[PDB]
Amino acid sequence: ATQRFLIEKFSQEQIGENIVCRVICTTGQIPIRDLSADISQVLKEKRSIKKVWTFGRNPACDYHLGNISRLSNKHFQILLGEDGNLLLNDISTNGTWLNGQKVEKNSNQLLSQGDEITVGVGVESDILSLVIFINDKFKQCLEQNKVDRIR
């Protein structure tokens, strides 16, 4: 078999290529996206953050959401590094919220399991929520931090 094999992968997709965390919109506005980072880089990098995602209505931003006035070009930024765990950074004009708690802009916060970021606060009808899903696979490798396989 050859061509048929390619079809088999169509139904059975291999999830977890090198994903760090997943972003899911609970308010139903933006399509689910998956944040990823290279393990080799994370293992080699001892200082600073390995990789950070920028979210906003800008097509540049690592994450693209609905073009909302309450949101900024780069509404928020997510960073993964340090001795494990993940960090959430806000970069919006109108502010970024975490589970109803407004965090300090351009500030790093300790990620939470299935956490959620709210944005567009100020107008009851202009708030958007986002949920972050962290895969245990990434943490599993970080715990071992040992290389013994190709790709």
Binding site: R57, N58, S69, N73, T93, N94, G122, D126
Partner: peptide, 10 residues
């Protein structure tokens, strides 16, 4: 072809 940032109207 232009952004738009604000902080609610009041």
């Amino acid at each position: 072809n232009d952004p738009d940032t604000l902080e609610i109207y009041s």
